[PDB]
Design a protein around this ligand. Structure first.
Ligand SMILES: *[C@@H]1O[C@H](CO)[C@@H](O[C@@H]2O[C@H](CO)[C@@H](O[C@@H]3O[C@H](CO)[C@@H](O)[C@H](O)[C@@H]3O)[C@H](O)[C@H]2NC(C)=O)[C@H](O)[C@H]1NC(C)=O
Ligand SMILES: *[C@@H]1O[C@H](CO)[C@@H](O[C@@H]2O[C@H](CO)[C@@H](O)[C@H](O)[C@H]2NC(C)=O)[C@H](O)[C@H]1NC(C)=O
Ligand SMILES: *[C@@H]1O[C@H](CO)[C@@H](O[C@@H]2O[C@H](CO)[C@@H](O)[C@H](O)[C@H]2NC(C)=O)[C@H](O)[C@H]1NC(C)=O
Ligand SMILES: *[C@@H]1O[C@H](CO)[C@@H](O[C@@H]2O[C@H](CO)[C@@H](O)[C@H](O)[C@H]2NC(C)=O)[C@H](O)[C@H]1NC(C)=O
Ligand SMILES: *[C@@H]1O[C@H](CO)[C@@H](O[C@@H]2O[C@H](CO)[C@@H](O)[C@H](O)[C@H]2NC(C)=O)[C@H](O)[C@H]1NC(C)=O
Ligand SMILES: *[C@@H]1O[C@H](CO)[C@@H](O[C@@H]2O[C@H](CO)[C@@H](O)[C@H](O)[C@H]2NC(C)=O)[C@H](O)[C@H]1NC(C)=O
Ligand SMILES: *[C@@H]1O[C@H](CO)[C@@H](O[C@@H]2O[C@H](CO)[C@@H](O)[C@H](O)[C@H]2NC(C)=O)[C@H](O)[C@H]1NC(C)=O
Ligand SMILES: *[C@@H]1O[C@H](CO)[C@@H](O[C@@H]2O[C@H](CO)[C@@H](O)[C@H](O)[C@H]2NC(C)=O)[C@H](O)[C@H]1NC(C)=O
Ligand SMILES: *[C@@H]1O[C@H](CO)[C@@H](O)[C@H](O)[C@H]1NC(C)=O
Ligand SMILES: *[C@@H]1O[C@H](CO)[C@@H](O)[C@H](O)[C@H]1NC(C)=O
Ligand SMILES: *[C@@H]1O[C@H](CO)[C@@H](O)[C@H](O)[C@H]1NC(C)=O
Ligand SMILES: *[C@@H]1O[C@H](CO)[C@@H](O)[C@H](O)[C@H]1NC(C)=O
Ligand SMILES: *[C@@H]1O[C@H](CO)[C@@H](O)[C@H](O)[C@H]1NC(C)=O
Ligand SMILES: *[C@@H]1O[C@H](CO)[C@@H](O)[C@H](O)[C@H]1NC(C)=O
Ligand SMILES: *[C@@H]1O[C@H](CO)[C@@H](O)[C@H](O)[C@H]1NC(C)=O
Ligand SMILES: *[C@@H]1O[C@H](CO)[C@@H](O)[C@H](O)[C@H]1NC(C)=O
Ligand SMILES: *[C@@H]1O[C@H](CO)[C@@H](O)[C@H](O)[C@H]1NC(C)=O
Ligand SMILES: *[C@@H]1O[C@H](CO)[C@@H](O)[C@H](O)[C@H]1NC(C)=O
Ligand SMILES: *[C@@H]1O[C@H](CO)[C@@H](O)[C@H](O)[C@H]1NC(C)=O
Ligand SMILES: *[C@@H]1O[C@H](CO)[C@@H](O)[C@H](O)[C@H]1NC(C)=O
Ligand SMILES: *[C@@H]1O[C@H](CO)[C@@H](O)[C@H](O)[C@H]1NC(C)=O
Lengths: 379, 218, 415, 196, 98
């Protein structure tokens, strides 16, 4: 409740974004999910087909909210977030397997199915969608048989499935596996998120093909090769971006930030304070601009005094005359030219005996910490 | 015939722009000064294994070499990538062509797309079923071997054929010496200039001096 | 090889005494301060992410204590600079007439022609020494102009007043007489200075010119400071690179994790990232604290050297360069100080026959100051560090006892 | 505010201890920061996970505290070595080192004990009232050059004396205050005066 | 016991190395402290978790060892600076310091 005289680092200044920018390719094509999930015939597990999905807008909301799917498991991504983020391409693997083996089609699984005819990688990013097909597939039907992740293996190791409607566990299931990739590359499949007009030279919340971030977008002179979509810095963050709609490159500079230091004398003297915004210009915030930042609440004074509260770059602050906080360039000492010449000497005619005090720490409190009792006391 | 690869076979590992930095990338490059097989097209398209990655360098004066084939048996018993570049059209097919005993060009299909003095360097590799191509063109004045210098290669197409490719072949237009390198997973110290152009590189596994340069990132 | 072999021509009655000398100016370079870097908890670990900040709140006061440690280091840097340089109460300036008895000092005095009043050697030194993730660099309290003003004041006070300005008020004295004081302080009579003044001024000026040439040619002289700068910059670079590591998470991008997964799993990924980045911050802060302790030790040494070597004449051996210390001059350097130590080095020694004492009338005579030497035929008494033979008189020696005690006593006449 | 050096050490130690104590109230991701609450609530299989989170957090807190303590102890040991050196060289003797024992010419020092420290009362000699004088490196008497044995030659305007360095005690320039070396043609700035 | 100052340094370094070696026998919460035993036991999905626990423990051990070594090196460097000063001022000359 009482603060001593000095300068204290308290908070952090950060320019907040004014508006959010969403930019996606303006393709009106719809991804052909109907011909995948509602296909008349599905391939077998040994020869599961790999449908190629690209250059279209994929609406996963209908897929997620459709009640016809027995299970809807997404492993690398959230099913709700599918519409917002987007991918370079999507791969749908369609096949029919034994009902109890729906567990086996998951990352990090082993079994007769997970090892022989269909294996998912441990770094799988995508969604698996399965539903029973008793009223389409069951007859009996003997067209289904079985025999490195994503392999197609086209006394024999091949034994067929006999599916009949009078069979829950043994009942057939139709499953579609959606595979996603997240390499930084020109995206072609993006969800139904409407793009917006872009604004420059303003702290905004941009979103380029699912690449979220906050910063100031300005015109850039950096040449981006035609295959280059993003530019990244040393810290893996995106430095420059190429607009998906118009082929232009925009610099990404983070919004202005800096520490906030409050300059005060003691509350026992006064309650006035001065605020220093470290390393910012006096535009993003009785305003004094220093090399240490922007100083607010302190009056600039031409006179130079001994430093009282250090601010930086030769600037100090003090509470002086009515009284107020003043900012000044600190004085190094009184000027004194020695009366030097080649035949003059100054010799003291007197002296004084001075006793000065020097104070030195010698020891510190001998604290011993019971390690076990501190971490796991009486447990 | 064999010869040294000098400092060729360098391409941009990814589509990310980098400027005035030295980036280290663990990617399939060809080793510097490596032994690259030499083939003669005067007065040869044998069986060439693909291994884990394949480079290509073609020194051209009359565009004799135009296409490439990819597969395991190449007798229409399995899917085979086929790339042909005739006139001003680039044609790519993937299906089970019944190739001849000695395939050449005179002077169940799942995918299809239709679009010395010259060096057309190439890169071919399959990653989880994704076929990637890197290419670049540069003019020289030399016929004996690879000129000594540096030049980067940029990607063109990703073809997700997902086809087992343990072998490949070239297409010769018979009325052109071509080189077959090989790419190994070697770390390279890539030097990007202010324009994002790779002006120099260091093969971290070439010699102890290169190891020092890579460890010091300089 | 450990050095050239040198067997000393030692014998029980032989002494070597220098007949000449050389004035050598050597350079000692000491780090004083380092860069004042500040790091932000939330912007480094959980930059503009409310979920990540809320998850980081479960760790307590770790990174606020880290911020406290970094602030302590930053204040310590300014304290080090103040202790080293602000050793003078007043800003002394030299007279417009540089009548220093042949000594030049032009290359170490401030140059008014420059926007920053730095000397030629200070300019040479400053020309020899060469982000957006919550990392800020705080400017030092004392600007380079103010450091140059301190060095100028110290050097002007030294030149114009000897050690009197360091002791109390500045008492002017001609520089030749000050150098005579210094010669007396190393055991050489001041008449040696007053008789070799031109030679000594020429030697000092030549040594200063050699310092200039060395600083202009060799760039590895400032290695002590460049090492500190490189260490700080490279620690910062490592801290920045640590933000690109997954630490077991699906991705190293917090925004990518947030936009992808539901909060229950984003919590796991963000917690892995938080643990990794917190460990990186703690490692960086510990290294910074140890390096700051080293820099504080160096700055304490530099302040002690300034006080005992620039503000006075030091009798400690090798504390102020090799040889008998005469005087030192400070020069400001980027995050450091450079001392120009002026020392006296004996040059041309000669072999003499020596005796502990001399018999005159059954009495033993010992030199008041100096030693007894013989040029083969005649015995003289000369000061230790300069061959200035003199007739052995009763004013040169004192009597103690008789001839039957001293081992090695010789027979001669005491005038 | 004179005892700030000691008060800072005391405050730093107490504040480090306070931070170490406050670190015991953090969840570190567990359901609760109370070990007894965790144990009385969950079966051993899940109590193991919660307790492991707490253990990692508290062990990290202890390691941070101990590292800071070691660094601060090294600093305190450096200060104590300086204090011991000052005692030995400044109380047990007279120090010629400049500013090692206060400002001025050191005479003697007195030790005083302070809580976790030591206080030195440095007695020094400080020249007070200087006067301008005309001076000369040497003096010509009979074609000889006379240099002061100890002190300097000064002139009060008309007469030349010899006085010690740090106190104005003018004395008649005699052959016992000076020594002879060479002649008058070498010294720069020699002056003419009689040597008694 | 005259050379206790040096024997302490030797013993401290040996004890630090011994502690670093012993830290390899700790489970750190994993089912085993033997990396080969863990690998030969479980599938990669769970071996990854066990190996990650071991990695965290051993990395913490290494960081602790390096921090202690840095602090001890600073102390030894202070002692060596004192020794060099003593040599220069006390063997190469005569010292008036009490
Ligand atoms: C050298 O400096 C000392 C002081 O450091 C001088 O001693 C001071 O001399 C003055 C003048 O005689 C004293 O002032 C007198 O004080 C008495 C106190 O009873 C007062 O009654 C008089 O009216 C007058 O104000 C002063 O006290 C004295 N200081 C001390 C500590 O004794 C000394 O005179 C100086 N010597 C020379 C040669 O300049
Ligand atoms: C002090 O030294 C400087 C440089 O060493 C002298 O200045 C030089 O003077 C000569 C002759 O006048 C010129 O040819 C040079 O160009 C000067 N150099 C510089 C850097 O100024 C200076 O004269 C010396 N001081 C005295 C009193 O002679
Ligand atoms: C002492 O050494 C100095 C050199 O440091 C000698 O001075 C040199 O003398 C030679 C010959 O007279 C000259 O050519 C040089 O130019 C002089 N150098 C300087 C810097 O003045 C000096 O002669 C020596 N004294 C004795 C007595 O031998
Ligand atoms: C040793 O020094 C003495 C004194 O300088 C030398 O004696 C003088 O020698 C010169 C000529 O060499 C004569 O003019 C003087 O008259 C001599 N002085 C006396 C008092 O006799 C002596 O020659 C020197 N000896 C050697 C071996 O150098
Ligand atoms: C120094 O001189 C004294 C006398 O001037 C020498 O003393 C003589 O020593 C011899 C022995 O060799 C005696 O026979 C004499 O009687 C002594 N004389 C006197 C007056 O006592 C002394 O030996 C000389 N020293 C040297 C080293 O020759
Ligand atoms: C400089 O000092 C000398 C010596 O103290 C002064 O000369 C004396 O002055 C007094 C008073 O005028 C006379 O009684 C003495 O007889 C003088 N002594 C001699 C040897 O002449 C001289 O007056 C002083 N000058 C100044 C300007 O202070
Ligand atoms: C101190 O400096 C002055 C000049 O400031 C010197 O005075 C000169 O002396 C020379 C003879 O040595 C004369 O030729 C000049 O005319 C004098 N100039 C002036 C302006 O008076 C004085 O000699 C110097 N003294 C010493 C001891 O160095
Ligand atoms: C000190 O006295 C000597 C003589 O004892 C002075 O030297 C004379 O100076 C005058 C004027 O320049 C000349 O005319 C004489 O020829 C010189 N004589 C000798 C023997 O050198 C000397 O000038 C005096 N010093 C001062 C500073 O006045
Ligand atoms: C986006 O729209 C612009 C015109 O507004 C057009 O030039 C561009 O080709 C479009 N991009 C896509 C991917 O449709
Ligand atoms: C398949 O058809 C059903 C209705 O028969 C519909 O509800 C579902 O959305 C369709 N799925 C796709 C992927 O078109
Ligand atoms: C500080 O505050 C106290 C009251 O808490 C008051 O008695 C004292 O005078 C104050 N000191 C100053 C210097 O104002
Ligand atoms: C602040 O911005 C102005 C222009 O708007 C510029 O002239 C000035 O130099 C800037 N100052 C700082 C400290 O950035
Ligand atoms: C300082 O004085 C100058 C004129 O001497 C004036 O222009 C300037 O505004 C003054 N600055 C302040 C902060 O008062
Ligand atoms: C390359 O081939 C030459 C002969 O043509 C052979 O001597 C050399 O060992 C080979 N080097 C490698 C790396 O294959
Ligand atoms: C090139 O080859 C293709 C074979 O795929 C053929 O159809 C075409 O006519 C040829 N010529 C051109 C100009 O494309
Ligand atoms: C095409 O593939 C089917 C797969 O069962 C196979 O039966 C058929 O023979 C193939 N046809 C050709 C021409 O390869
Ligand atoms: C690809 O074909 C080769 C040649 O028959 C075969 O050995 C290999 O097992 C096949 N599959 C691969 C390389 O994954
Ligand atoms: C970058 O490009 C500009 C013009 O496009 C050219 O002038 C400059 O030389 C280039 N620099 C490099 C390093 O390629
Ligand atoms: C003194 O004499 C010895 C005899 O060996 C010789 O080595 C040495 O150089 C001589 N010293 C001088 C200064 O001449
Ligand atoms: C010095 O040594 C010599 C032999 O080298 C010997 O004759 C002489 O007596 C010795 N003198 C003294 C004083 O030791
Ligand atoms: C000596 O004379 C100079 C002449 O400028 C003057 O400034 C100085 O104060 C004088 N010193 C004393 C002690 O009177």
């Amino acid at each position: 409740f009482t603060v001593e005289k000095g300068i204290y680092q308290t908070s952090n200044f950060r320019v907040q974004p004014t508006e959010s920018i969403v930019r996606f390719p303006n393709i009106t094509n719809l991804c052909p999910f109907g011909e995948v999930f509602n296909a008349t015939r599905f391939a077998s597990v040994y020869a599961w087909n790999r449908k190629r999905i690209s250059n279209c807008v994929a609406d996963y909301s209908v897929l997620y909210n459709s009640a016809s799917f027995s299970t809807f498991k997404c492993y690398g991504v959230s099913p709700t977030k599918l519409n917002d983020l987007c991918f370079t391409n999507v791969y749908a693997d369609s096949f029919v397997i034994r009902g109890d083996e729906v567990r086996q089609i998951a990352p990090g699984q082993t079994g007769k199915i997970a090892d022989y005819n269909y294996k998912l990688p441990d770094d799988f990013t995508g969604c698996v969608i399965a539903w029973n097909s008793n009223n389409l597939d069951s007859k009996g039907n003997y067209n289904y048989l079985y025999r490195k992740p994503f392999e197609r293996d086209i006394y024999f190791p091949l034994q067929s499935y006999g599916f009949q409607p009078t069979n829950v566990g043994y009942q057939p299931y139709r499953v579609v596996v959606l595979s996603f990739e997240l390499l930084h590359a020109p995206a072609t499949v993006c969800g139904p998120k409407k793009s917006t007009n872009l604004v420059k030279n303003k702290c905004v919340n941009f979103n380029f093909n699912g690449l979220t971030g906050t910063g100031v977008l300005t015109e850039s002179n950096k040449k981006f090769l035609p295959f280059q979509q993003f530019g990244r810095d040393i810290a893996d963050t995106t430095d420059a971006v190429r607009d998906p709609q118009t082929l232009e490159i925009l610099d990404i500079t983070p919004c202005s930030f800096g520490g906030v230091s409050v300059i005060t004398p003691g509350t026992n003297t006064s309650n006035q304070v001065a605020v220093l915004y470290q390393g910012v210009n006096c535009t993003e915030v009785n305003v004094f601009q220093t090399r240490a930042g922007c100083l607010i609440g302190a009056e600039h004074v031409n006179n130079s005094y001994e430093c009282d509260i250090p601010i930086g770059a030769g600037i100090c602050a003090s509470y002086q005359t009515s009284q107020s906080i003043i900012a000044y360039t600190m004085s190094l000492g009184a000027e004194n030219s020695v009366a030097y010449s080649n035949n003059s000497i100054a010799i003291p005619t007197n002296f004084t005996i001075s006793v000065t005090t020097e104070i030195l720490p010698v020891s510190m409190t001998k604290t011993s910490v019971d390690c076990t009792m501190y971490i796991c006391g009486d447990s | 015939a064999y010869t040294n690869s000098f400092t060729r076979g360098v391409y941009y590992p990814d589509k990310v722009f980098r400027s005035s930095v030295l980036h280290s990338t663990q990617d399939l490059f060809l080793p510097f000064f490596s032994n690259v097989t030499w083939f003669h097209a005067i007065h040869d398209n044998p069986v060439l294994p693909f291994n884990d990655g394949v480079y290509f360098a073609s020194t051209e004066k009359s565009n004799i070499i135009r296409g490439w084939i990819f597969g395991t048996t190449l007798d229409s018993k399995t899917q085979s990538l086929l790339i042909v570049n005739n006139a001003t059209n680039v044609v790519i097919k993937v299906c089970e062509f019944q190739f001849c005993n000695d395939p050449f060009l005179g002077v169940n299909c799942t995918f299809e797309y239709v679009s010395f003095k010259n060096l057309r360097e190439f890169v071919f590799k399959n990653i989880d079923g994704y076929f990637k191509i890197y290419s670049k063109h540069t003019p020289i004045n030399l016929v004996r071997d690879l000129p000594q210098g540096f030049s980067a290669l940029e990607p063109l197409v990703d073809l997700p054929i997902g086809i087992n490719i343990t072998r490949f072949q070239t297409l010769l237009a018979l009325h052109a010496a071509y080189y077959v390198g090989y790419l190994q997973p070697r770390t390279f110290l890539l030097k990007y200039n202010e324009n994002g152009t790779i002006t120099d590189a260091v093969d971290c596994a070439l010699d102890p001096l290169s190891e020092t340069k890579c460890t010091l990132k300089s | 090889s450990l050095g050239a072999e040198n067997s000393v021509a030692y014998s029980n009655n032989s002494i070597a005494i220098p007949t000449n000398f050389t004035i050598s100016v050597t350079t000692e370079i000491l780090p004083v301060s380092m860069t004042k870097t500040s790091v932000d908890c939330t912007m480094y670990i959980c930059g503009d992410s409310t979920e990540c900040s809320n998850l980081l709140l479960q760790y307590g006061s770790f990174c606020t204590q880290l911020n406290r440690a970094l602030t302590g280091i930053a204040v310590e840097q300014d304290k080090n600079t103040q202790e080293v340089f602000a050793q003078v109460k007043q800003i002394y300036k030299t007279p417009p007439i540089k009548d220093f008895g042949g000594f030049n000092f032009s290359q170490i005095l401030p140059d008014p022609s420059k926007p920053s009043k730095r000397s030629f050697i200070e300019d040479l030194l400053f020309n020899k020494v060469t982000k957006f993730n919550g990392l800020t660099v705080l400017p030092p309290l004392l600007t380079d102009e103010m450091i140059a003003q301190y060095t100028s004041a110290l050097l002007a006070g030294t030149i114009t007043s000897g050690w009197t300005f360091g002791a109390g008020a500045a008492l002017q004295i001609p520089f030749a007489m000050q150098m005579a004081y210094r010669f007396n302080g190393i055991g050489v009579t001041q008449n040696v200075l007053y008789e070799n003044q031109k030679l000594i001024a020429n030697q000092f000026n030549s040594a200063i010119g050699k310092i200039q040439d060395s600083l202009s040619s060799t760039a590895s002289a400032l290695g002590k400071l460049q090492d500190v700068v490189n260490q700080n910059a490279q620690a910062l670079n490592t801290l920045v690179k640590q933000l690109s590591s997954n630490f077991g998470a699906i991705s190293s991008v917090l925004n990518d994790i947030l936009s992808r997964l539901d909060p229950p799993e984003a919590e796991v990924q963000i917690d892995r990232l938080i643990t990794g980045r917190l460990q990186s911050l703690q490692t960086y802060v510990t290294q910074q604290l140890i390096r700051a302790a080293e820099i504080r030790a160096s700055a304490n040494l530099a302040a002690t050297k300034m006080s005992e070597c620039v503000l006075g004449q030091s009798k400690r051996v090798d504390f102020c360069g090799k040889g008998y210390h005469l005087m030192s001059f400070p020069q400001s350097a980027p995050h450091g100080v450079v001392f120009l130590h002026v020392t006296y080095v004996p040059a041309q020694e000669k072999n003499f026959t020596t005796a502990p004492a001399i018999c005159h009338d059954g009495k033993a005579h010992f030199p008041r100051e100096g030693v007894f030497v013989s040029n083969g035929t005649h015995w003289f008494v000369t000061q230790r560090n300069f061959y200035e033979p003199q007739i052995i008189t009763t004013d040169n020696t004192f009597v103690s006892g008789n001839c039957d005690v001293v081992i090695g006593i010789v027979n001669n006449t005491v005038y």
